[PDB]
Design a protein around this ligand. Structure first.
Ligand SMILES: Cc1ncc(COP(=O)(O)O)c(CNC[C@@H](N)CCC(=O)O)c1O
Ligand SMILES: *Cc1c(COP(=O)(O)O)cnc(C)c1O
Ligand SMILES: NC[C@@H](N)CCC(=O)O
Lengths: 427, 398
């Protein structure tokens, strides 16, 4: 397994960028260090600068649900860019995507496009407080909602992988308004409301967690959050930046029948380009400028190129058999890894919903972040590296959910299961 | 001059998005409320969904410095997307753009790419505070950095002096647009930046230049290079994206090391450093490295600016402003404008009439008196001639 070129480039990048990467999640520090430099990706595969080919289960972290470099999306982008990539003024495509998002997401009646999930969440945070007139938020331990200050509290994703504390650089007076509770813990949330009467603007969360590994809400958890938030006139905010368009066309809210008041979107809606969005109940969105007083702008927001990527992507997802397929190949893969761990004598757990799955090296089961942290991180590290040598690219972290795409073939899955057999048999 | 299609599309957008736009200013609420919907842009022009063409001085708010849909940028993008638009892992192009940005901006020795100027600013404010262990940050009224904060009049060193004194050992640093564009075009008075650098070093505080708009426009190395004042941290955006969503923040190495995964301060981004966006930025900078780039911008823009002012002069309209490279401003007030309060004296009703007149003359100016104007390498001398000819007509009828 040669990673000569990757190491050469990564060594140079460390002198040019923090940690030699544009995002901490790509660090590889919890998997034995030494990230691999991609040269190109297509369908379910990625190719190293060293020429090594991998069956990719990262999908650039969610966006590539239609597969890498889908020809119809690339074709649409080629045609679109000839018309200029950014206008700085309104364009028809914004209306088209907006209309598509409004019809796809139950809670969304009005939407505002931004450029990333971080911007969408930061915006929804501001809108929650501006709408309710309350300053305190409730976020769950292990959930990640971008790096806006108030969200850097018991955050998952890179924060969990890198074992960092609540990020410094944030005034403690700002994080004071961020209350935290264990995921899947209603009573804890009930208690928080009782302790801060009239101060909770709302409850924000990943309706299905992917940033502290894969964690699904227990029966009644989402229904309960909607119930209690309604009781205190608090908003329920679904961060479907990762689950959006992946768990289902309408995300977790549609698939589980629980409708929030606001929801953020990202990744997939950008179809491979930088895009995000936040929307929800019309009466709440009307506070957003220029309709309302809450100022939120963006130079590249709603640019024609990004809108084209999003529209084409959603159009592909609307075709029949799409989510059926994702759940079909992902369940087999998921069941495979577990059946393999069992046979090879490794304590493991996890599951999957549509094209999103998780595999923990712990008997579990996992219901919250604390349960996830009990995974054998040393084992995962050896497992992640062995899979890499076997041609399988997994997220360099035990706290990141895995992704499959419409491009992964039954063949690719079998090959992935074979690799896992070989890797776990040697763990 | 019809805009039927624009009105219809905008009317429908108001039911789909707040104000029917993805960004406040686009709604034209400061100049009548009748926005024009773009279908395509090219070189120095923009086309309506109604078929109307305009000589564009917005340049999508800064990014289109090389001209709209530059054929060489589009080609690079086509070549690049065949390999996938986003990897989610390191790619060689990131090293390339990083090196170019490091070589281009004096203060940057290490850079971190993001997807917008707002992300850059969020991160830079938090880094300032993490590096100094202080919570207070000083900004200026009229300066924009996306959206414990002490304000102060722009071009006012004494007010800054007072802020440090009234908050001993609490000021992480001072952040500002080295040259203002978000409250109209306002240049720093002689010694202002030098002053800020002196006072910040004086109090072991950081100096941060928000060059999201000035970067690569005022000069290849932004204001810090042109005016020769070096901050500790700088944010970049707009032009580094070459028309795509890209931002960045960087500065002294020892400071940037605190950024994860190198340090404890967290900041991440799924689309950060994607090959497509890196390609757009790389091509854009390579084009700006060609001969006569900034000379040309400074030339046509000086003519434009002087022209507008001369026309206001000849037509009896109090006006002020000026330009630096391909960035300029025009205020309907005699000023001159040194800060936000000065800018606020401008005659907004007059600017609105002017904007609409220019629009009808085939000139697309920023739909706000408080926005700097921009030129591109695509703007020809004739475009400028046509523009001034239009400005004459409109101001004559104002
Ligand atoms: C639920 C949720 N909410 C908000 C975000 C941030 O969105 P953004 O990266 O587009 O800025 C995310 C980002 N997830 C991205 C990760 N898979 C790792 C990639 C990274 O951070 O660079 C998320 O999952
Ligand atoms: C444009 C601008 C920003 C905002 O950047 P976006 O890419 O719109 O998020 C920040 N600061 C300044 C000075 C700007 O001009
Ligand atoms: N900060 C706001 C302006 N750059 C306007 C962006 C737009 O609407 O295109």
């Amino acid at each position: 397994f040669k990673t000569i070129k990757s190491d050469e480039i990564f060594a140079a990048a460390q002198k040019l960028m923090p940690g030699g990467v544009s995002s901490p999640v790509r660090a590889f520090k919890s998997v034995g260090g030494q990230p691999i430099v991609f040269d190109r990706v297509k369908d379910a595969y990625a190719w190293d600068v060293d020429g090594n080919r991998y069956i990719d289960y990262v999908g650039t972290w969610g966006p590539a649900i239609c597969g890498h470099a889908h020809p119809e999306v690339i074709e649409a982008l080629k045609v679109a860019m000839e018309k200029g990539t950014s206008f700085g003024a309104p364009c028809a495509l914004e209306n088209v995507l907006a209309e598509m998002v409004n019809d796809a997401v139950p809670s969304i009646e009005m939407v505002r496009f931004v450029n990333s999930g971080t911007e969408a969440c930061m915006a929804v945070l501001r809108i929650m407080r501006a709408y309710t007139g309350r300053d305190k938020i409730i976020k769950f331990e292990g959930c990640y909602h971008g790096h806006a200050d108030m969200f850097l509290v018991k955050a998952g994703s890179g924060v969990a992988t890198l074992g960092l504390p609540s990020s410094p650089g944030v005034p403690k007076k700002t994080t004071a308004n961020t209350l935290t509770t264990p995921y899947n813990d209603l009573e804890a949330v009930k208690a928080l409301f009782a302790e801060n009467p009239g101060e909770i603007a709302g409850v924000i969360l990943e309706p299905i967690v992917g940033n502290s590994g894969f964690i699904v809400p227990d029966a009644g958890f989402l229904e309960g959050l909607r119930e209690i938030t309604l009781e205190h006139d608090a908003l329920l905010v679904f961060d479907e930046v990762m689950t959006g368009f992946r768990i289902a066309y309408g995300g977790v809210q549609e698939k589980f029948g629980v409708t929030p008041d606001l929801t953020t979107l990202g990744k997939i809606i950008g179809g491979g380009l930088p895009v995000g969005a936040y929307g929800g109940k019309r009466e709440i969105m009307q506070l957003v400028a220029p309709a309302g007083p809450m100022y939120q702008a963006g130079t590249l927001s709603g640019n024609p190129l990004a809108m084209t990527a999003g529209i084409k992507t959603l159009e592909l997802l609307r075709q029949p058999g799409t989510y059926e397929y994702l759940d079909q190949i992902t369940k087999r893969l998921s069941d495979g890894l577990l059946a393999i761990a069992q046979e090879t004598g490794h304590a493991a757990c996890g599951g999957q919903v549509s094209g999103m799955f998780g595999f923990f090296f712990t008997e579990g089961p996992v219901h919250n972040y604390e349960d996830a942290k009990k995974s054998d991180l040393q084992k995962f590290s050896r497992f992640h590296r062995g899979m890499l040598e076997q041609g399988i690219y997994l997220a360099p972290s035990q706290f990141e959910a895995g992704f499959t795409s419409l491009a992964h073939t039954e063949e690719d899955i079998d090959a992935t299961l074979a690799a896992a057999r070989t890797v776990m048999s040697a763990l």
